[model samples]
Target: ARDPKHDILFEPIQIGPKTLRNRFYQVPHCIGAGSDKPGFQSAHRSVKAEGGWAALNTEYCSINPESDDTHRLSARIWDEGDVRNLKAMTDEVHKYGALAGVELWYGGAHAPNMESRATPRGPSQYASEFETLSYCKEMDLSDIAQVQQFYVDAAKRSRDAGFDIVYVYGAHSYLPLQFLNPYYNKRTDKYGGSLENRARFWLETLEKVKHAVGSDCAIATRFGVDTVYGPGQIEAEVDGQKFVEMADSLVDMWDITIGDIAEWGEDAGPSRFYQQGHTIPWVKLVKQVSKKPVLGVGRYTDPEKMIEIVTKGYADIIGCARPSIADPFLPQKVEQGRYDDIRVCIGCNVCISRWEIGGPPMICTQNATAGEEYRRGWHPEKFRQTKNKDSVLIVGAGPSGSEAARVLMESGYTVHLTDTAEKIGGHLNQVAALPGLGEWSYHRDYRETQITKLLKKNKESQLALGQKPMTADDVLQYGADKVIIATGARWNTDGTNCLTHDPIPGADASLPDQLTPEQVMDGKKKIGKRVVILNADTYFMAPSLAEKLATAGHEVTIVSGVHLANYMHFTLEYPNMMRRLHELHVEELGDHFCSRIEPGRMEIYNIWGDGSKRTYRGPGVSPRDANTSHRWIEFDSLVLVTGRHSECTLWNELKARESEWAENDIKGIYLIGDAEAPRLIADATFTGHRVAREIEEANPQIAIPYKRETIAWGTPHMPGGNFKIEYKV
Candidate 1:
């Protein structure tokens, strides 16, 4: 039942020696699973194949030890052990008649041999941006030859491991691109001079890899065509058309991206700052000059946009990484005319933040089963049938409650979702209304749409909006088999945080004039003409609101206790956040501690250890040269962005009345999302999915953790399995 418009997507396309059954390409993206957990890694790929991804590309696979990353998790293939493990992963994809590609990666100077304890090589002597502690030595003629052979060896191993396409990874500021750029390759030898000379190493390596295996497998080149670089020496290359004009004949498929490795977030800047297929215009520049089929990614989530990428001649294949992660069955869902069934990627970038820290597996805001496909035996589309018929009452319509309601109804449970707010999304809605966050509504819009459709088709599901506040007695007598409270979180006005167990000194003194993000976004608390937001948060809320309020004509100033807004860096919104803040004329002062508060002016001081210490009292604002570490600024209203206090009143009431469960036939009482711990929205959604998944064994004492992988050994599977701790060999 393929849609007439989507029929083109299912048509086969030739990719060198191999042909893809469909144009849906799952481009490579790293999960926290590395070579150490082959069993875990293979299962992650197997699901994509099962879900109808036409071509599956492995995450960055190292060519040799010189490409080593000490802490990062990527596919490793320096020897036969790695090849054998990769072969296992490819076999799974092959079983579904799909093509598997491998990105042959070398960090060059970018790879810090921290654990490998080996120095990385570059085109010339330069320091690695990723591992700043180490410097890359200049490569000799022999060094260049050895690096060329690394590609040959990796290509051979990839073919042995069943990869049909080998990607010469020249994007994201890595090895091949290091040779391609004049900034990194500073040699005057045959490898360096003009642009043609600079591209010699990459050209020669592609030739060797093609000669070795390209006749059998497609030789793909991923280049940052329009870098937004001398390590950024040459910033604008304009579609890399000049580079591709020379290398196009040798490349079987052209994969173009923008921006260098140093600013990866902007290269693929999260959805908060970019729209779907925002990079299409840049990528389309390649189609004019390239001999090979061109493909690129822009986190595309819409079927119409994907079709446009192909039919409009921007690319021959629809390439994506995050979209496929959010919904593995994207292609088939469209082909089968189930477009609404597609769970679009929210672009929260919670997926990328997992690897930036070097471990702890991976999680997703939209897909709870991203990295747990094997260990947890979870499927994105498939769910185990309900063990018995039960009516589940879920409170809150935010990410957690919406996800729980969707999954529980799919599992054959009668789902009733309640929320005090008229609209779904809860806090995320308010969070989205902040400056430059309209795209964030996708998170809410996606879930709400799915839940709406679910209730429409499956009469077992119901949404009760704007419900009256529930009491301990009301919940206990709700007549549901189980109850889940997901009533989200609210920002703090007390300035209390992990650092300050108590409210900041003098915070409560101006209770009449201060408000939290919740109050500000809700339009309840009127923002004053001169606003000072004391941002103890390391994330986006404080900065985003500061920019929003300033843009709306308020004289705004933001003061943070930390050095800078740190979480924005991880979330890929830092660069633009800074730019927007500056444009909005928002003032920022870091390393500040709130000292005292009055109706006219607020007191602040720079304490030792970046304001973690007690603030010293001074002569105050009216006087000049206070000579204390103290300062003061005037503000009519103060906004507090410290952190959120979990709203667990319902949880406490339910807990106090836990003995009445059997009396009302309430099988279990659960707390999820903000009501549980008030972490990231992605984790909250995962918590909801996890709770719904393990409802059969819901208990207080017995803890059944998700399965983990040890060295060549395996842990227990889901149900009836004994618990084991996470141990890495």
Candidate 2:
């Protein structure tokens, strides 16, 4: 049933002593699962293996204590305990005929050794360009041998723990790459100066690792083909391609990337600035010279792009991280000709944001069950059948309502989904129209497609779009066992913001000069030439609108009380977005907010006017100097990108009539999504999903307790569970 053109993708390829069953490779990506969380690591990877990914890999694995990344989670192969923990992952993936890989990493100055309190060694002494106040010790000749031995020891442990491929991770400015690039290796010894000397350290590490595990495991080196920055660093034509040719005989395959650790967005590029196969031009430089197979990642999800890259000789294998997390069964879905069922990644980088922020588990905007696989025992493609035979009425067709309807129908329930809009997506339709957010439509597309198909199977289930608003009396008269309210949220039009938590004077959107985000998107409102956006929100709405307006030939200035788009910094979209704003000549006034709005002007004040000095005076007296920095700024139009409020009038009516629920034969009434509380699109979808999955529970509003993997006191391991460790002898 698979497409004939995609047959080439399923073909097996041999790499050294190992054979990949197919070209679908899940590359190394952090899931907040280090060696400490063995269950999470095993469950997350094995699901992908079961879905037909040929190879599954761990995130960057530290070879020794000196390379400890304390805040950010990374796999450790330090001792027998680590080997035992990692073996659980290997065993699970192996059950589905998938190869397991480990990336042997030695971060030089980039590794903040907070836990180990050990100093890291590098080619030369220099501070990390990424991490603040962190520097590496200058390595001597003996230090190089000890570090090389660490890779050799880790490689042996990888083979012992049943990894089919061992990587010398030179990408992301690790120790091996630090010695490869002259910017980090400024020494006058034999390991510096010439290209051969610069490539010596990585090549030697690969040779030693190959000698240790080459017969049993494949040897791969993840190399950044270009540092992206010009002249001073490694360029593809300058030294990147030459090094690939030099180490071709030693490495079984090459995992290629571009840019350094600081700006890895160039490699894992977000959809806002880059598209699929964005790195093909730089990655092909490796394939052109190397005799070994080459694999690269570019947020690949489309099967046609995967085929194009392989047939065109751009890459030998399709590498993925974000795509695989969004849909664990993407490969299997393609193989079965189920293309419409695949959940495409929107490239929001919410998955990477978790690792970047440190400590939290990764979550996907597309897939809600990503990290809940082990803890909540949720599967991406599987659902529990319901025996209640109850009919359900859902009062919105947004992200949450659509997802809940689809799940309920799949679970053998008759669901009636109704919304006032003609289309299914609630606010997402407007959100998708924003600058560089077209891919976000895929989130709605998937749910709509599934619901359409599910309706065919269950003829009784109905999806009523463009319907009149239903009241509490109409819902009680209707025949339904349960009711759900998912009416979404709307942006504040009254200039009510997070800073003051009150509405600004004379700042009503009903005025012709004042507009809300919704009105701006509608394009019916008359926007002026000189625009000012008053923002207290810390996300993308304000900045995205600024870009849209600035590109439309309007002079735009943003008055922000909070850090503008502070959440974007975690999503890896901050730097590029700021650059785009600068190019468009958009003015930004940070630590400033609006005090009041007049006819054609607004009074603004600096939030830091008091200069950080505060004294506890009286209840009504001033704690510091009165903010006398208030000044009037003239503008033709004012846009409010402040806080949001839930549209929960229907829910309030239902709650008030709770005493009449028994008379109407309504078993339960629940609130979900933005109607419950204003939140992210991902969290809104999660609330709907949680309620549907636990519909039969005693109280579905409050979630049941999930299994917590923790050690109990006075016990060797966790209570009611075995702590088994199988050491590799």
Candidate 3:
């Protein structure tokens, strides 16, 4: 089990005067549990450090005194009162034998607090700039000095509070970066003008921090090497060699990043195809000149790729933010030779979307236990086995059924998995059939592999896993304990697809001939050249179909009633879809509703601010004149991508067979995945994992204690499970 990559990865690395246990550095992300609740932040850090992370960087805690605006529920660490909470967190991290670090920042424009207090000053109109309300006054040199001293003081507080490293936040267009960038700093004093002058404030702040903390504390600077305002805006590449030299002169350690905060779509490390490790080159260039240890992040998931980066000296530490969210036990799992158990991050952006959509903190799309570290106390390794020993029948071996079967088997129950289709993946198979959605196959493949391994390990476990070639009578005869149905939903044929009961004339007649995109992709049906995809699902399916059709040389136009194409947002594929729309020349009609589908064309009504109506024909050749008042153009095909309702036919059947089942179903029966709640594959997988554990706990003979401390990091110091004896026993 010796990994050659382990040497460079697990070997202790020196950052300034301080040493880190490994090269794996957990970058900053809101753990959701904040300091407001007692022991919340401490619990979050303790689990991560315990999971074997060499270093844990706290989510950006603002340095400004008035930074606690609470508009976004951000962490604040400006005052001495915040020290207790941070000290508690640092102590917990140390208890796990991991180095602790804090990313201290004055979020220049990206600071949500600035939206209420300060005006936008920077040159870029990126989203981060919008976070600030006003610009810094040129006359306030004293204010600049005060801000610098705040970092120095914060460094001292963190060092005294037991933090191994104090990060001087310069990346993500924070206050320090604002003073460094000439685009934001339009001052005439020492803080503005030439590259060296513009960087003066940041350099001075670093020097003061180093002086205050002395050699005992390590000062790491997260530097944004590029900006969205284009090439000349942020000092990067050959053009900004002077900026590199300036950075080399001041910082002890460098955390290099690129792009502004507002342009998160471009900056956030999601997909490798878009900008594949965009900041690596910059870090490599800086490494050539600087003597400091450098850290960089760009979705480096592959351990071999990480080793390559470090072994070749691309970066001293691998910055992992999202990867850790998907699987916090990544380092330990890799070390223990349990690679298959590591939950892989699909980079769908669902974790980031949760924060942006104003939801509860971040949670992994693949892993459900991310933000619930304190609440659930769930861990990857320690799961209980069931002792029920009852046979379980799972119908429809799609995502839900497969998940349920997997969980049932894990819980020590006999499972009989059956699918109507030849394959196990239901709608997922069809959805993954769409172009650009090949990445989704990982879900089915992973499940299949895991299930196969489990079945091999437990030969005595009764498992009737196969296609539903056998009759229903045969399945019913084999089943002895409980039956779980997972038959998926289907598209409706009626005209009752509207949001409300507002009906249009001849709507039923227009539905004479139609085919779902899934059917079309499967070659079960053919579509005409002039196609109008009426997208209503608010997910990526509609736009995906549009792209597929347009790529096949069809004149495709996607019509939606929402503000913008929203389907992409649901799948965390918005950025890719936007780029695809531009590349494929797909026409998107927003804020418009469909009135009716004609023989040769579809009529769309533009619901303007006023009550006036304007109709427009889609595309293709028509018999009508150019000056037609009705706005009839032409079209050969109408593809409805609007919406779909979940069909509960299987659930209804189960209810009909046993009326009391809904009220008091068998203890072994379980509903999981899209069958319980129709959503993404990630949700289905989580449901499967959760249900398995629930079943194991319900079993009487298992004797699995409800031990919270059993799942915590570090090996349990207590003796075997039978060490303590009960007097009654």
Candidate 4:
């Protein structure tokens, strides 16, 4: 039974010729699956449809060869082959009564056109601020007609491919946006200058697309309601609202977004700096002006917040990208009043990082099976039952351990999940205590909640916490048939780092003046006024600790050999994080590393201090000048954010006594998560989930080969075509 308050969320709304089944609309986001990976695109979208999302849109489908966005994946509808491939997604989504949409994209210069080797045309010949080296040719009257025709042809092909909605994508400073904003358009023609003149290209494109597919598909337009850069760009009250009013009757619906491509973090704001519904104010401004239904995304996961959005008329649809990826069955769970079952997105932009890095498919921190649905045949909400009813004992109640226990219990196996700590989350409990990382606890919360509920159903299953550390002898005597070691990793205490692959002399966390990440979070160690964090890792630890300590009135200086928090750049968190650190007066010394540490001081040197000269030398001899820029820096306390080492003592002990396993009736032993190799929390959770999924395989320790989609050597490249092939060496 659905809550009466949430009924607004389940209400159907009309969008021209199409009627949305519900308010859950999966707005377009890159999945690293273009037309080339038809099965991935089809299965990924259709899963959302089955979970009750009203509509699913492809991530920026290119209109023609000239607008090709290679390296990063985007759907293509260029010809008959593309039409056949894209239909696979639309056909599957339609089977579950969900409308399919395609964002017809024409990147002005952002397209790069590396694959097609064609020139991209825009209103003016400007180099892309985002893709710096890429420039577009200035469009004349002839160029304008060709581009509009490209959109029309793509729309017709989209209709032929069974799409229910067609989008004139003008967001993210694409071709249409190039003409709309004065920053990109300096032309004095009918398509530039004043707001209406600048809006003429987008308005004309929408009108042309609607004219071609108006009867068959609903026309939608995604517009940046505001560029968030102030007067120089489109602000909500200025040309943004005016453009909406001007193009109101031209389209069936409005998909509102903010910010440009260069710093899209303003639009897809990370949880570190922004909260859910952060775009409500700007999106609602568009809602106030637009006549058609409006939709906006802000990492929505809360059902109550969703109800408020619809009831207050901020937007007609609940557009989601990250939330939907975290839990495809979000709407279905809400409809059934199973809110606790919903795995909420923690707003960590790990999914976006993949698309930014290029090539790799997107993965989620909350959902381990995000990109594994088709390849590994894993379902987020479904698990296969185990035939053998054996009891398993797992040590460590961390991300990986908890996930493994939950999946195994769900699969009808008896499980004993134990940890030395009283809580379920391992290092995460401390990590969440960091500023703005509170939502990350949801990953552990979901597993803890689900496993607790599942324990009642399986009376034999147990989640034992605050237990003594299990020894190898204790494990061998345990009655469980199998064992899983998931003891998580810890930050180096002796300052063993990746840079030198050795420990810094005189660096020891056991000392009163020194601390590790865990020790710092524990708050047991006494600290002094000045602090220095010597970092070799490139993730969040050093920066986060700097923020925490700096705010606590300690003078903080980070001496880093690598780019500090370099990974945050891919997660869209770098700019804001840097701003926050700068505001806190935290100092940073880049390209510097520690050479040695003393009681109250450490010697540091520039990583590139050696002169740019090299010579052939004898074996193991120096090939370049020895760095001699070493200097001692005094500090009251030292924090080592150097590196991580897996805590695999128990695993090694168990493996050493593997000969006694048969006598003890132990069938197999597994090592997952940090115990096997330290990695991302998402990857750790994935390893745990994968082991449970394939527990019955011949060698459960190693994963089974997944299905790979590739064209056969002798097969034709396209359907109903003659064989043609080429091999690259």
Off by over 4 Å in 4: 720-729
Query: Total clashes, candidate 1?
Result: 4
For each of the candidates, give the backbone clash count: 4, 0, 16, 0
Per-prediction CA RMSD (Å): 5.4, 3.2, 9.4, 1.8
| Candidate lDDT values, in order | 0.80, 0.91, 0.65, 0.91
Better of 1 and 4 by lDDT: 4
Could you tell me how far off, in angstroms, the CA of residue 490 lies in candidate 3 after the best superposition?
4.2
Q: For residue 216, give model 3's deviation from the true position in Å.
A: 3.8
Please identify model 1 stretches exceeding 4 Å from their true place.
229-239, 457-460, 508-512, 609-628, 698-703, 712-729
TM-scores for the candidates = 0.93, 0.97, 0.84, 0.98
lDDT of 3 at 200: 78
Question: What are the per-residue Cα lDDT tens digits for candidate 4 across 1-729?
Answer: 778899888889999999999899999888988888888898899989999999999999999998988777788999888898899999999999999999999998998888898999989999888778899999999899989999999999999999999999988888898899999999999987888889888888888999999999999999998998999988889898999999999989999999999888878888888889999999999889888999999889999899888889999999999999999999999999999999999988988888887678889888988888888888888889888889999999998999999899989999999999999988888999998898898998999899999999889899899999999988999889999989989999998998889998999999988999898899988878999998999889999999999999999999999999998878889888999999999999999999888899999999999867899887897888899999999999999999999999999988899999999999999999988898888899998998989888888889999878776777664667777655666
lDDT (0-100) at residue 285 of candidate 3?
Answer: 69
Query: Which wins on TM-score, candidate 3 or candidate 4?
Result: 4
Candidate 3 stretches greater than 4 Å from native: 37-40, 68-70, 114-139, 238-241, 272-279, 396-400, 421-425, 460-466, 469-483, 490-498, 501-513, 567-576, 608-633, 659-665, 696-729
Q: What's the distance in Å from true for residue 235, model 2?
A: 1.1
